[PDB]
C-alpha cells in the first residue's frame, strides 16, 4: 500500500432493506414471477442476503415450483427459501 | 502352509472370533438370510508387525482349506507404467471360479498416509490407485467368500474410508 | 468420367500411409521450411513448387509427406482454441445492471 | 559487383557442387536432436522423445565451439548423423528475464537528494563507460550496491534513473517467486540467470523487498524451514565462491536488511549503505517544485506554504497528492487545481501510511 | 471399398479438409491424411467416434456405425440392480433432488423454461462413501430402470501414451 501504487481502497455498502432488492430488480427479468411480487416488501422479510444469496434464494424458489408443477412463483414460495438459505450460512 | 495350528496364538476369544465370519458362508449361509445383512468381510490388524500378526495368514487360513494368494505391496508397485490395482482386478477371477479363496494384504502402511498437503510426486498416484481397490468393496462385486484383511503398524492418518464399519469389522489388537 | 476415374485414383493415392500436419515457426533462405510436428520434435522440411517462403505465415497447419516429409500444400490455418484456459472476455454478460450498488 | 567476373569464376563452380553434397547429408527431415557431449573421435549422442538409439559420428560443418553440451543440432536424414546446429534467440526457457528497452529517465523528481545521488553514481555508472583507473591504482571496484529503507520514496526511484544513465543492457530479476513451498527451486534458477547472461557485460540486476531469506541465528545451519535458508546459500556462490570480472551486478532494495545483511554482503564485494532520510527545507523544495514543472495550478497559491510545517512527505507521498488533487480538478475539466484540493490530498495520505510511534521528548 | 476389407485398423476423427480428402488421427498417435471414400456417409462424422484404417496403406476403410462402441472402456448398462431407494429414508429433505435433478429434465424440459433458472446440470457430491453417499447412487438405477453407466475412474486412465485418450473420448 503506497501513495500512488494503490490510490484508494473502496468499501462496499452493507446490506439493508434497500440493498436486499438489489438482485431482485434485475434477476427477476429472466426469472418467471407474478405481478403480486413486491420486491421491496418481500425483501423486508429476508435477512443477510444482498448480492450472492438473493440469487440462491431465487434459485430455491424454482425448486419449490417443481413440487406444485406450475408455471408461476408467488410470495408464498419465497418464505420457504428465506430460512433454508440462512441455515447454511449460520453453520460453522 | 505346511505348518500346524497357531504357534503365535493362544487367544481363544479373538482367534475364534475371526473364524465365525469365515466358515459361515463356506457351508450354510442361512444365518445372514434371516437377519438380512451382507456377509462381513471386515478384518483389521493393528500392532507390532510379524509378532502374533503376520503369521496368522499362513497358519489360520492354511487350515480353512481355501485358496490363499499372498498379495505383496512391493510386487504391485510396477515402477514403470504402473498397472497397480488393475493387476488385483484380474486376481478376483479366481474368486468367481474357486469360491474358497482368501486374499491377505501383508503389512501395508504405504497407502495409509493421505498426505493432507498433497505435495507428493510419485505418491499422488498411490491415493489414485487405492480408489480402484475401494471399488471392490463398493461396486458390482458381492461375494462373501474373499476376506478383506489389511494390516498396519500405527493408527496414524490412515484413510478413514477403508476403515468403514462395513469394510473393516474385526479389530484384533496385539496385547 | 471424372467419378469412376476418381475411384481408380483412390488406389494409387492411398498406397502411402498418409500425411503429417504441423505448425511452421519460421522459414529459411535455403528453400526449406521449419515445421513443428505435434507428436514429435521440430523438423525443417522442403516446400513444393506451388508455394514459396514469403506466403508461409508463422504457426500454420500444412501438409507433409510420409517418408520424405516434403511440404505439399497449405491445408488449414491456425487453430481456433488458444493456449490452455483463456478466461479473457470482452463485453461480458454484465453490461449495465447485473450486480447493483 | 567487381569480383563477380574474375574471382567468382573459381568460386561458384565449387559453391553449387558442395550444396549438392549437403543435400546428400541433409535431405529434408532435418531432425533436431540434442548433443550431450563432444567426443574427440567425432561421435555424438542422439536425443529425442522417440528414444532414439544411434552410434552417429560427428560430421563436418560444426566445430568444437559451435557444438554445445545440451543445445539442439541438426541431424542426417537416414543415418541421423549430426549436420548443423540450432540458433538460439528470443526468450529462453529459464525463469523470467527481461531483454532490452530504452527507458526515458533522468534526475528530476528526486532532486534535492543529490547528497546520496552522486554517491551511488561513483561505484555504478562511472566504472562502466570508462574502464580505467584500475590499471594505475589496482583496487577492484565494488560489484553491486545495497539499499535499505522505504522504497519508491526516491531511494528506489534513484535506481530507476541510474538504469537509463548506463546506456547499456539492464536486467531486472524477481526475488519473490523463490519462496515457493517447493524445496530446491531457489538455487537452481538463480545460477542459470548469471551463467547464460555472462556474455553481455552490463547487467545491474535489481531485486525488491526480500523479507524471507537470511535465517541464521546462533549457528550457520539450523533446524528451521528448508524453503528459506538454503535458497540464500546460492547467493554466497555468486558474490563469494564464484566471482566474475565485474559484469554481473546485484542490487537489493528492501525495508530492513539488518539481520539479512551479513550473510551476503561480505567485507568488500559490495559496499553501499543508503537509508531513507527526512528531507530538510531545501530538499522538500526541489522535490515538490520540480514535480510542478509540467503541472499547472492557481497562481495565487504558493508551493512552499505547506513545506514549512509538514510531517515526513517524500516523493512517493507527493505523487499521490498530485494525482488525488488532479482527479478532483479534472472532473470539472480544468488543467489547474484549486487550493482546497491541496490540503485535502495531504490529510488522507498523512492519515493512512504516515504513522509515528508517538515517541516525544527523548 | 473391398481393397480394404479385413485388415481394420481403428482410427479417430480429427477435422475435415476437402471433399473426399481429410486427415484421420490414429490410435498410435500419428495423424494420417487419406482420401475419404465417396461411399462413406459424411454427416455421421464427429470428433469422438472411431473409424477404420488399413495396416500397410493406412487408408480410411469404413465409417463405423453406432455399434462402434468399444468395450476396452467397459461400455454397458445396468442389469437388475439391488439397493432400493424407498427403503433408505431420513435424507428425504436433501433427497428431493433425486427425481428433480435426474428424471425431471429428461421427461419435461419445458418446466425450466417456465421458471427461468439454470437446471441442475453439474452435480457434485462430496463426503465419505458407503455411509449412504454411495448407497444413494445405487438407488438411482431402481427409480430410473433404464440405461445406466457406473464406472469409477481412478487408474482407469492409462499411465502411458494412447490408452488414456481411449477413455477420454467415445465414453
mmCIF file with all atom_site columns, N, CA, C and O in Angstrom, chain A residues 1-5 7-8, chain D residues 151 160 316-317 320 324 348:
data_model
loop_
_atom_site.group_PDB
_atom_site.id
_atom_site.type_symbol
_atom_site.label_atom_id
_atom_site.label_alt_id
_atom_site.label_comp_id
_atom_site.label_asym_id
_atom_site.label_entity_id
_atom_site.label_seq_id
_atom_site.pdbx_PDB_ins_code
_atom_site.Cartn_x
_atom_site.Cartn_y
_atom_site.Cartn_z
_atom_site.occupancy
_atom_site.B_iso_or_equiv
_atom_site.pdbx_formal_charge
_atom_site.auth_seq_id
_atom_site.auth_comp_id
_atom_site.auth_asym_id
_atom_site.auth_atom_id
_atom_site.pdbx_PDB_model_num
ATOM 1  N N  . UNK A 1 1   ? 0.852  -1.186 0.000   1.00 0.00 ? 1   UNK A N  1
ATOM 2  C CA . UNK A 1 1   ? 0.000  0.000  0.000   1.00 0.00 ? 1   UNK A CA 1
ATOM 3  C C  . UNK A 1 1   ? 0.889  1.238  0.000   1.00 0.00 ? 1   UNK A C  1
ATOM 4  O O  . UNK A 1 1   ? 1.598  1.502  0.975   1.00 0.00 ? 1   UNK A O  1
ATOM 5  N N  . UNK A 1 2   ? 0.844  1.999  -1.088  1.00 0.00 ? 2   UNK A N  1
ATOM 6  C CA . UNK A 1 2   ? 1.699  3.160  -1.272  1.00 0.00 ? 2   UNK A CA 1
ATOM 7  C C  . UNK A 1 2   ? 0.866  4.298  -1.841  1.00 0.00 ? 2   UNK A C  1
ATOM 8  O O  . UNK A 1 2   ? -0.139 4.055  -2.520  1.00 0.00 ? 2   UNK A O  1
ATOM 9  N N  . UNK A 1 3   ? 1.257  5.548  -1.581  1.00 0.00 ? 3   UNK A N  1
ATOM 10 C CA . UNK A 1 3   ? 0.554  6.685  -2.189  1.00 0.00 ? 3   UNK A CA 1
ATOM 11 C C  . UNK A 1 3   ? 0.814  6.816  -3.682  1.00 0.00 ? 3   UNK A C  1
ATOM 12 O O  . UNK A 1 3   ? 1.731  7.524  -4.111  1.00 0.00 ? 3   UNK A O  1
ATOM 13 N N  . UNK A 1 4   ? -0.007 6.133  -4.479  1.00 0.00 ? 4   UNK A N  1
ATOM 14 C CA . UNK A 1 4   ? 0.121  6.090  -5.922  1.00 0.00 ? 4   UNK A CA 1
ATOM 15 C C  . UNK A 1 4   ? 0.453  4.735  -6.510  1.00 0.00 ? 4   UNK A C  1
ATOM 16 O O  . UNK A 1 4   ? 0.327  4.572  -7.731  1.00 0.00 ? 4   UNK A O  1
ATOM 17 N N  . UNK A 1 5   ? 0.867  3.754  -5.705  1.00 0.00 ? 5   UNK A N  1
ATOM 18 C CA . UNK A 1 5   ? 0.767  2.370  -6.160  1.00 0.00 ? 5   UNK A CA 1
ATOM 19 C C  . UNK A 1 5   ? -0.657 1.856  -5.993  1.00 0.00 ? 5   UNK A C  1
ATOM 20 O O  . UNK A 1 5   ? -1.217 1.238  -6.905  1.00 0.00 ? 5   UNK A O  1
ATOM 21 N N  . UNK A 1 7   ? -4.181 3.704  -4.883  1.00 0.00 ? 7   UNK A N  1
ATOM 22 C CA . UNK A 1 7   ? -4.729 5.022  -4.589  1.00 0.00 ? 7   UNK A CA 1
ATOM 23 C C  . UNK A 1 7   ? -5.712 4.968  -3.428  1.00 0.00 ? 7   UNK A C  1
ATOM 24 O O  . UNK A 1 7   ? -5.447 5.523  -2.357  1.00 0.00 ? 7   UNK A O  1
ATOM 25 N N  . UNK A 1 8   ? -6.847 4.305  -3.629  1.00 0.00 ? 8   UNK A N  1
ATOM 26 C CA . UNK A 1 8   ? -7.897 4.246  -2.624  1.00 0.00 ? 8   UNK A CA 1
ATOM 27 C C  . UNK A 1 8   ? -8.447 2.830  -2.556  1.00 0.00 ? 8   UNK A C  1
ATOM 28 O O  . UNK A 1 8   ? -8.523 2.129  -3.568  1.00 0.00 ? 8   UNK A O  1
ATOM 29 N N  . UNK D 2 151 ? 11.255 1.976  0.001   1.00 0.00 ? 151 UNK D N  1
ATOM 30 C CA . UNK D 2 151 ? 11.370 2.065  -1.459  1.00 0.00 ? 151 UNK D CA 1
ATOM 31 C C  . UNK D 2 151 ? 10.333 3.018  -2.036  1.00 0.00 ? 151 UNK D C  1
ATOM 32 O O  . UNK D 2 151 ? 9.373  3.419  -1.379  1.00 0.00 ? 151 UNK D O  1
ATOM 33 N N  . UNK D 2 160 ? 16.009 3.549  -10.557 1.00 0.00 ? 160 UNK D N  1
ATOM 34 C CA . UNK D 2 160 ? 15.333 3.548  -11.850 1.00 0.00 ? 160 UNK D CA 1
ATOM 35 C C  . UNK D 2 160 ? 15.953 4.557  -12.809 1.00 0.00 ? 160 UNK D C  1
ATOM 36 O O  . UNK D 2 160 ? 15.988 4.318  -14.021 1.00 0.00 ? 160 UNK D O  1
ATOM 37 N N  . UNK D 2 316 ? 7.143  9.884  -2.928  1.00 0.00 ? 316 UNK D N  1
ATOM 38 C CA . UNK D 2 316 ? 6.019  8.967  -3.079  1.00 0.00 ? 316 UNK D CA 1
ATOM 39 C C  . UNK D 2 316 ? 4.736  9.576  -2.532  1.00 0.00 ? 316 UNK D C  1
ATOM 40 O O  . UNK D 2 316 ? 3.663  9.417  -3.126  1.00 0.00 ? 316 UNK D O  1
ATOM 41 N N  . UNK D 2 317 ? 4.826  10.280 -1.400  1.00 0.00 ? 317 UNK D N  1
ATOM 42 C CA . UNK D 2 317 ? 3.651  10.941 -0.842  1.00 0.00 ? 317 UNK D CA 1
ATOM 43 C C  . UNK D 2 317 ? 3.157  12.063 -1.745  1.00 0.00 ? 317 UNK D C  1
ATOM 44 O O  . UNK D 2 317 ? 1.949  12.310 -1.821  1.00 0.00 ? 317 UNK D O  1
ATOM 45 N N  . UNK D 2 320 ? 0.943  10.951 -5.008  1.00 0.00 ? 320 UNK D N  1
ATOM 46 C CA . UNK D 2 320 ? -0.497 10.794 -4.836  1.00 0.00 ? 320 UNK D CA 1
ATOM 47 C C  . UNK D 2 320 ? -1.189 12.137 -4.636  1.00 0.00 ? 320 UNK D C  1
ATOM 48 O O  . UNK D 2 320 ? -2.287 12.353 -5.160  1.00 0.00 ? 320 UNK D O  1
ATOM 49 N N  . UNK D 2 324 ? -4.294 12.769 -6.682  1.00 0.00 ? 324 UNK D N  1
ATOM 50 C CA . UNK D 2 324 ? -5.578 12.900 -5.999  1.00 0.00 ? 324 UNK D CA 1
ATOM 51 C C  . UNK D 2 324 ? -6.178 14.283 -6.220  1.00 0.00 ? 324 UNK D C  1
ATOM 52 O O  . UNK D 2 324 ? -7.374 14.416 -6.508  1.00 0.00 ? 324 UNK D O  1
ATOM 53 N N  . UNK D 2 348 ? -5.469 12.713 3.768   1.00 0.00 ? 348 UNK D N  1
ATOM 54 C CA . UNK D 2 348 ? -5.718 11.290 3.574   1.00 0.00 ? 348 UNK D CA 1
ATOM 55 C C  . UNK D 2 348 ? -4.437 10.497 3.352   1.00 0.00 ? 348 UNK D C  1
ATOM 56 O O  . UNK D 2 348 ? -4.413 9.291  3.628   1.00 0.00 ? 348 UNK D O  1
#
